[PDB]
């Protein structure tokens, strides 16, 4: 879906306490825009995007009041999951939820999402039809049965098709230029000696946004799949990203190609002195 909204929610049970730690993170097109954390000095949903700062105190109060209800929901659901899995209170357990919507090219609902995980594994997800559930294993069947028998999916369907699409439209309007915004990478090639009659040439991509990028290597214009080593895309911590790709090659005659949506055209690079 061209545009999306998600809420990533976590409840971690704290041994000894009646209350678990609850964290909720909102995203628009995978960029964080709001956050709630029950561990805060003043537990409240807070803006995490500048364009969100335009929202009034009735908005934050409402969202915070929701997070309070979610905190109780996850507290009870954690307690019940101990029973389904025959666990004791003495340990720490994790309940996660991902939910929201994707908008199509016509800005209409493409599809709604509602997924749950217990202990880092799929537990229960709402199907694309927004009425049927997929349970991951046998324990998850107890919840699926309790949810079919109460018709729980209807209430989620309504949020997903209504409020979700409504607020996503608002956030895209209020967030305007920052969504489509890009930063071109700054490419350079480093030279490192490897062994005898061989060298390692590393092609760095730095200061780019968004995180999507493609670095490749060529010898007389030919692609190199398995014989090329890279790192996973890593944040610089300033909002930009980094990535590198290297080839172990016997002692120019070697080119690197940088592909980023922020570039006017691809970048082609080679070793300096």
């Amino acid at each position: 879906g061209p545009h999306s909204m998600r809420y990533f929610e976590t409840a971690v049970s704290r041994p000894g306490l009646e209350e678990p730690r609850y964290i909720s993170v909102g995203y628009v097109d995978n960029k964080e825009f709001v956050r709630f954390d029950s561990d805060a000095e003043n537990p409240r949903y807070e803006p995490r995007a500048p364009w969100m700062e335009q929202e009034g105190p009735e908005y934050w109060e409402r969202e915070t009041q929701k997070a309070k209800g979610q905190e109780q929901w996850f507290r009870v659901s954690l307690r019940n999951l101990l029973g389904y899995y025959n666990q004791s209170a003495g340990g720490s357990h994790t309940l996660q939820q991902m939910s929201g919507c994707d908008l199509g090219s016509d800005w209409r609902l493409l599809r709604g999402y509602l997924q749950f995980a217990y202990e880092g594994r799929d537990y229960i997800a709402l199907n694309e039809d927004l009425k049927t559930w997929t349970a991951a294993d046998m324990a998850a069947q107890i919840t699926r049965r309790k949810w079919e028998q109460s018709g729980a999916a209807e209430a989620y369907k309504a949020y997903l098709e209504g409020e979700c699409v409504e607020w996503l439209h608002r956030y895209l309007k209020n967030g305007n230029a920052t969504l489509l915004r890009t930063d071109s990478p700054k490419a350079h090639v480093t030279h490192h000696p490897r062994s005898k009659g061989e060298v390692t040439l590393r092609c760095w991509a730095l200061g780019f946004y968004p995180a999507d990028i493609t670095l490749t290597w060529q010898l007389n214009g030919e692609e190199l799949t398995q014989d090329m080593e890279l790192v996973e895309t890593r944040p610089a911590g300033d909002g930009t990203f980094q990535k590198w790709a290297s080839v172990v090659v016997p002692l120019q005659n070697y080119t690197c190609r940088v592909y980023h949506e922020g570039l006017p055209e691809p970048l082609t690079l080679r070793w300096e002195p």
Binding site: Y7, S24, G26, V34, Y45, R62, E63, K66, A67, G69, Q70, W73, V76, S77, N80, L81, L95, Q97, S99, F116, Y123, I124, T143, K146, W147, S150, A152, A155, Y156, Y159, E163, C164, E166, W167
Partner: peptide, 9 residues
């Protein structure tokens, strides 16, 4: 805007 879950697990 976030949603509030219904029936517990």
């Amino acid at each position: 805007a976030s949603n509030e879950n219904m029936e517990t697990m």
